[PDB]
Ligand binder design. Structure first.
Ligand SMILES: Nc1ncnc2c1ncn2[C@@H]1O[C@H](COP(=O)(O)OP(=O)(O)OP(=O)(O)O)[C@@H](O)[C@H]1O
Ligand SMILES: Nc1ncnc2c1ncn2[C@@H]1O[C@H](COP(=O)(O)OP(=O)(O)OP(=O)(O)O)[C@@H](O)[C@H]1O
Ligand SMILES: Nc1ncnc2c1ncn2[C@@H]1O[C@H](COP(=O)(O)OP(=O)(O)OP(=O)(O)O)[C@@H](O)[C@H]1O
Ligand SMILES: Nc1ncnc2c1ncn2[C@@H]1O[C@H](COP(=O)(O)OP(=O)(O)OP(=O)(O)O)[C@@H](O)[C@H]1O
Ligand SMILES: Nc1ncnc2c1ncn2[C@@H]1O[C@H](COP(=O)(O)OP(=O)(O)OP(=O)(O)O)[C@@H](O)[C@H]1O
Ligand SMILES: [Mg+2]
Ligand SMILES: [Mg+2]
Lengths: 592, 120, 240
RNA sequence: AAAA
């Protein structure tokens, strides 16, 4: 690259002395100047075509003269920023000098250099103020001309996608302006712990403009930034992933024994999905996924295909860590010597083989851990929950392998008989062994139920649990004990109904949870049933929780990392990787 | 494999079932009892096989330190799944401890227990 | 009054909270534990004041006779009200007792408990549940004895606890009896736990902040002020 | 508004 940009005023002789800045000359020079006739391009031309290898160009802003008006200044700033973006070298920051011209456009050029990057900002001065070519020629031969460099500047690494998304704008007028930087500057602080809630400490080394772009409210147009972010999913059911569509079709096709599968059944569809306008009951939601699951994943081939497709969806969503919930007993049968243990081992082997294969090729891979769902009073005798607990405990002892079972999952039907207060004798063993416990207590459960889940079962995470506001003591005990809560915005929005749900007034409490300090996390519940992966699940918070900011999204990711059932060393490694990747993307995603 | 290959040639074969010993250590890591119980519970679910897990053994020091009166909560799940319980009572088997093992641990087989004649 | 009058003149002040020790005597009047618990619960209701009751302490001789396997009935109410529980498991702390304190007593922060190295499962539970340990360097060094005290080859486990991920906080126990304040207690780690770094001291301070019995908003304000002051002092030290 |  190695390009000069300079501002030419009444005295145009600044360009040669700026050219002589380095001791080896430059390659290309472009000068932006106002439309006044005082500036003489002939002087620059006669100095310049003597070196044909140097490309020189002049850009003039039409309709601007002496920039004595505020509208004149804003138009000049817009035009100069567009010209800088157009002449922005593809890979290397350019050189820029601002010695010539009045304070107005010189300060504009300095601000542009800060905003879009500049390899070196320097100043040129001389004692005698040379006018003729031999004047500064003799000045530089003797050495009177001095080069003033106040320091290198790295600029903001990515603000050039505006060049990609805005046209060349050769024909412009007083209408096509982009106040996209002024709006961020105004909304910097136009609105306590939000400044100290800084996650991923490398966010501090971000440019201040980027730091406050992160402070701006999240909008639906941040889809690319959300997708590029490394994310964490902690509530992702294995079965409810390939429920309907092409994924279900290929899962059915990859069956080992296609004769026994039931390809006839199809699930009923709700109009407007996934942005449904009517509440759906929990049993209806479960029936929505009856196409996949226990009645289909009995055969080994379907289960392997579903696991592979789920991992592919996770890695394609840039999810760098996931905790998949599975119920191996639901896909087990003694007809072909397929117990729950071998089903769980198949899931674990598929996940670890996929992760190892992706890691050997040095590709982005999603570390996946498994949670064994322990349904209560599901298939008759209550021995099923004990069998699930024992299966999870024995699955822990595998030890060697990438994917491992880290915790168990619970689900109580309505109240009383299955809430939290009966199986402490069962869970004493599960706590001794080292498994973690998660509760699905989001079925309009009484605060006593959540209390028993917190204290009787020592649950480390809570599913949904959207009714914590009515019990301030419950909020206090959840925050104090650092008990994370996992909420799925799409599933909660569809099942319960939150504004802008038609004929609904309740608001999503995720923003209030974040303000109060709850270790909240955003998940997917069932990807296939809800029809929304993690990226759009995070994106919908712009409507479910108006006024949420990008810092809140990164705080949600940090809370997901903190509340994940992982060892401290692995958590530290994951935090380091997430911090580096998040800094990398945030550097190169504020471009748009 | 041994039982099947003995049956293939049609000779005398010893049918063998397995008991998972839930040993008492008390020198730390008391979760060994829970680990052994869970291992037995999920091992019995194998279904097939001439040899299969049929129950658990309450080995370890039979002293008052780790008698059968403390771990009914652990063994409720074991009884639920269908695993028989066997209790070691070789040394210092007080009659109350054996009674608790019979009635609280639901043991269907007592190891040794040579001092039953002292308690009619 | 002291904190308010320090804030009024806009100088450095030490926000203090109180823990009501649920002491044991066993020379009679066994209702002392219940009386202390009720007093702490009622005193939490004061509401106002910069200094407020935030929890209780299970101090006193920790012999097996009075372990944490009984008073769950007492402490259910104290957990309901919103008072944190700190277990003084300094001496004769068997792994079963600490486990009961963690799970049955719901202890949010343990006292001393220097023998977690021998029990791996207990360490893993303590790390995962994110419950702090209050080890006082000078007090443990004087009582238990560690290197470089003569005829004592036992190594202080603070460095290993920090490496493993334990939320360890350095304290004083008794400023007078031990004779060393918090600064000297942190300084002694240079020889008590050789190889420990200054960033580890900052980690200890951060763990002390994280495991303190404070509300989330106050914790965030305290963390912001601590970041400010730590940056200032580090810059001053590196520039001089 | 001390290279307009
Ligand atoms: N929102 C929920 N409420 C109660 N139970 C749930 C919920 N979501 C999942 N489950 C549990 O998951 C299972 C329902 O799905 P299924 O048995 O078919 O297999 P899955 O892997 O868990 O999910 P799916 O098959 O739908 O993809 C049940 O065990 C159920 O208890
Ligand atoms: N899905 C992932 N993709 C890339 N890196 C990951 C992923 N998940 C975790 N990591 C982290 O990257 C590292 C995996 O490779 P490894 O353990 O050999 O260290 P590393 O190669 O030096 O780090 P990196 O892979 O980031 O270059 C770990 O630090 C791990 O925490
Ligand atoms: N060690 C053993 N040897 C032979 N038979 C046994 C042995 N153990 C059990 N059996 C029983 O004997 C039968 C094995 O042989 P089989 O089933 O063919 O009937 P069988 O030949 O009439 O009896 P047997 O083998 O005693 O002559 C089974 O009923 C089996 O339960
Ligand atoms: N928990 C606290 N919250 C706020 N300020 C505190 C707290 N504890 C002490 N301070 C005082 O605030 C200052 C520590 O933070 P800092 O040095 O950044 O000053 P400050 O931010 O201007 O004061 P403040 O935080 O009250 O607005 C010290 O004066 C200290 O005495
Ligand atoms: N290591 C400990 N274990 C249990 N309790 C302790 C311990 N150290 C101090 N205490 C508590 O301190 C008190 C013991 O002494 P005392 O009752 O006279 O009041 P004190 O001022 O705290 O200590 P002292 O006056 O003896 O120096 C009791 O409340 C006791 O529970
Ligand atoms: Mg769910
Ligand atoms: Mg003390």
């Amino acid at each position: 690259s190695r390009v000069l940009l300079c501002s030419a005023g009444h005295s145009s002789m600044v360009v040669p002395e700026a050219f002589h800045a380095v001791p080896e000359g430059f390659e290309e020079v472009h000068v932006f100047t106002t439309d006044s006739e005082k500036f003489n391009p002939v002087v620059l031309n006669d100095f310049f075509h003597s070196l044909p290898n140097v490309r020189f160009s002049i850009t003039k802003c039409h309709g601007l003269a002496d920039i004595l008006n505020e509208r004149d200044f804003e138009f000049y700033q817009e035009m100069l920023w567009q010209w800088y973006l157009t002449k922005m070298p593809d890979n290397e920051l350019p050189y820029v000098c601002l010695s010539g011209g009045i304070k107005s456009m010189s300060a504009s050029l300095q601000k542009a250099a800060t905003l879009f990057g500049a390899q070196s900002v320097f100043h040129v001065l001389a004692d005698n103020n040379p006018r003729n070519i031999e004047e500064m020629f003799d000045a530089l031969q003797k050495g009177q001309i001095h080069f003033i460099e106040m320091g290198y500047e790295p600029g903001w690494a990515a603000l050039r996608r505006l060049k990609k998304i805005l046209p060349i704008n050769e024909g412009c007028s007083r209408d096509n302006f982009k106040p996209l930087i002024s709006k961020s500057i105004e909304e910097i602080l136009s609105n306590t712990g939000k400044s100290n809630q800084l996650p991923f400490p490398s966010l501090a080394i971000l440019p201040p403009i980027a730091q406050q772009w992160l402070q701006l409210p999240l909008s639906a147009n941040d889809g690319a930034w959300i997708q590029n972010l490394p994310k964490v999913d902690l509530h992702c059911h294995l079965g409810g992933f390939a429920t309907s569509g092409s994924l279900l079709d290929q899962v059915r096709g990859a069956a080992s024994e296609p004769d026994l599968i039931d390809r006839t059944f199809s699930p009923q569809e709700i109009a407007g999905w996934p942005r449904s306008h009517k509440s759906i009951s929990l049993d209806k939601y479960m029936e929505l996924g009856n196409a996949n699951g226990s009645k289909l994943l009995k055969d080994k081939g379907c289960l392997i295909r579903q696991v592979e497709l789920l991992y592919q969806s996770l890695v394609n969503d840039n999810v760098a860590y996931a905790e998949i919930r599975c119920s191996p007993n639901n896909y087990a049968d003694k007809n072909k010597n397929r117990s729950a243990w071998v089903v769980l081992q198949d899931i674990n082997d598929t996940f670890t083989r996929l992760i190892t294969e992706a890691k050997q090729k040095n590709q982005f891979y999603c570390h996946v851990n498994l949670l064994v769902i322990a349904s209560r009073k599901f298939s008759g005798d209550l021995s099923d929950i004990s069998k699930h607990l024992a299966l999870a405990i024995t699955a822990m002892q595998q030890g060697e392998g990438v994917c491992r079972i880290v915790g168990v999952d619970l689900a109580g039907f309505e109240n009383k008989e299955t809430r939290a207060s009966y199986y402490e004798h069962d869970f004493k063993a599960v706590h001794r062994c080292g498994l973690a416990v998660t509760a699905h207590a989001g079925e309009n459960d009484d605060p006593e139920g959540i209390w028993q889940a917190v204290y009787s079962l020592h649950a480390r995470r809570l599913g949904h649990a959207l009714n914590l506001l009515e019990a301030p003591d419950l909020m206090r005990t959840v925050i104090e004990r650092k008990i994370g809560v996992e909420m799925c915005p799409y599933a909660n929005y569809q099942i319960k109904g939150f504004a802008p749900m038609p004929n609904f007034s309740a608001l999503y409490p995720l923003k209030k949870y974040l303000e109060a300090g709850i270790l909240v996390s955003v998940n997917t519940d069932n990807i296939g049933i809800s029809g929304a992966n993690l990226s759009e699940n995070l994106l919908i918070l712009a409507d479910l929780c108006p006024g949420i900011s990008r810092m809140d999204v990164l705080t949600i990711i940090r809370n997901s990392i903190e509340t994940a059932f992982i060892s401290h060393d692995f958590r530290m490694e994951l935090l380091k990787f997430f911090d580096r990747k998040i800094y990398d993307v945030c550097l190169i995603s504020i471009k748009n």
